[PDB]
From TrEMBL, chains A, B:
Boundaries of the shown chain within the full protein: 59 to 333 of 333
Keywords assigned by UniProt, alphabetized: DNA-binding, Transcription, Transcription regulation
Keyword S-adenosyl-L-methionine: no
One term of GO molecular function: transcription cis-regulatory region binding
Entry protein name: Transcriptional regulator, LacI family
Amino acid sequence: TGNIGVLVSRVTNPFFAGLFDAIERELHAHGYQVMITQTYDDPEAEERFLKQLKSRELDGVILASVEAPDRVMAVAKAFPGRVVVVNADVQIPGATSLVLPHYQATRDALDYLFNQGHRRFAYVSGGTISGAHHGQSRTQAFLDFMQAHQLLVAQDLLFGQIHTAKEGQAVGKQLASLAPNVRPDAVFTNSDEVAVGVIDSLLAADVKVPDDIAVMGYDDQPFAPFAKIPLTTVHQPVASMAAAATHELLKGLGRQVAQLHLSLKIRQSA
Amino acid sequence: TGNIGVLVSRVTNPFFAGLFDAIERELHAHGYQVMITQTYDDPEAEERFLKQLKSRELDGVILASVEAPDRVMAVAKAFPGRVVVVNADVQIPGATSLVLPHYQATRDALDYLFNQGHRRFAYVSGGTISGAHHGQSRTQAFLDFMQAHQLLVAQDLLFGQIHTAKEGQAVGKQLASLAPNVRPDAVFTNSDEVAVGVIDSLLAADVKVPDDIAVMGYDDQPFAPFAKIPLTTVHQPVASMAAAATHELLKGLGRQVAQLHLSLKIRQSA
Ligand SMILES: OC[C@H]1O[C@H](O)[C@H](O)[C@@H](O)[C@@H]1O
Ligand SMILES: OC[C@H]1O[C@H](O)[C@H](O)[C@@H](O)[C@@H]1O
Ligand code: NA
Ligand code: NA
């Protein structure tokens, strides 16, 4: 039982830190040493990481972020059993791949919001909304939801490449600046980090959350229940997906014998 | 420019995630691939990590946590220039070692608290307070502070091996249960994660923060300003220490030519 690598976009995303920790504690119990690398969505960083498996510095890898599916596929095909993909919204031929139903969860969270009476929506993504991006199952869910309710998408309430709390503060400060009649009723943040920042800037401006603007998180990160306005959010089953990924890897490695729900978490912010 | 390892106790500690990120972005700019491993304070995990340098799978290492100084020293002496230690409250012969003045910062934060009128103190540590532990410069500062003001240490208000928000919730629930006359006036948490959990349980019990119990954080983690009661805390200079550590490593590697304050951050919780 040797070295395993985990690949994520950003370790300071508490979702990824928590996924890594759950994977690492189980793999460690099985005798492996686990290391994490972050890409910041750079395909070159993904390539470089995969060279560690190609050169057999690692026995196996778990990818929780994917930039170049075709590159990952070629590695997986060359290293059968040694590449596992988890929660990257992609199935990679040659790699056991776990996909969670983010389109469904996003539609369900948006329906929740519509059912509370919200009609003017702001939508935030970590990707560039106009092109292919991380989180596009969610962007499609958003567009399908708006179409299903014949709601006009306001382009001025779409925010792309927003990842951190500090970026969310800037979004929230802009939304708080808006006249009541053009301000959104609700913000779909795609991230609890972003949500905390959005909410902080709204409250700084005496904008009421949720009464003036409801804020929907994503992930149910550790701080979510502890936030100033405890976050309503989409809960990802971090421990369960970690256990699943870990088992798939250990099975592929020949270590283990053969033998995941998103949920809406309602608190105060929406 | 090759592979660098970073060693920390726990990646889900936002202090460590943030330190890693700052190191990694600078090293990445210099052409290195950086990986992080966590120990959960297990000396065997530290040993295993150091084998990666001994076997030259890594070019260099940065340790932000140390379990067995003498073991780290032997490696550093065998691999001159390749082992850097940062913020581990230890100087390791053979490794450039950066120490921050946590005893001073702790005395200063406690003096702050005494000056606000607090007299009955609870003290929380991530270590086992009775023996040698991570954070003992801080424990000594606490005991010296109490002695300097002739304050009796209440053993029942000392909490060891407390690391996470969930553990802090349990501490806070116990403190909130206390009759006003035996309840502390102030809690020194040693961690912003712990502080958020303590405060949440106090507020759940209608204990006022800071009026009934003041809560002092440690680190100034990303969520600190965003907490329900924004944290008064000891700010660690994450970006500066990362840059320093990175430079010391790159100098030792022959890549770079030759060429840190803690501060009290006052917000609302104390
Ligand atoms: O934390 C926000 C998001 O970050 C990453 O994109 C993860 O892959 C996604 O699952 C998570 O929702
Ligand atoms: O996050 C709480 C503490 O965790 C670790 O012990 C770090 O070494 C220390 O610097 C930090 O204050
Ligand atoms: Na409203
Ligand atoms: Na008081």
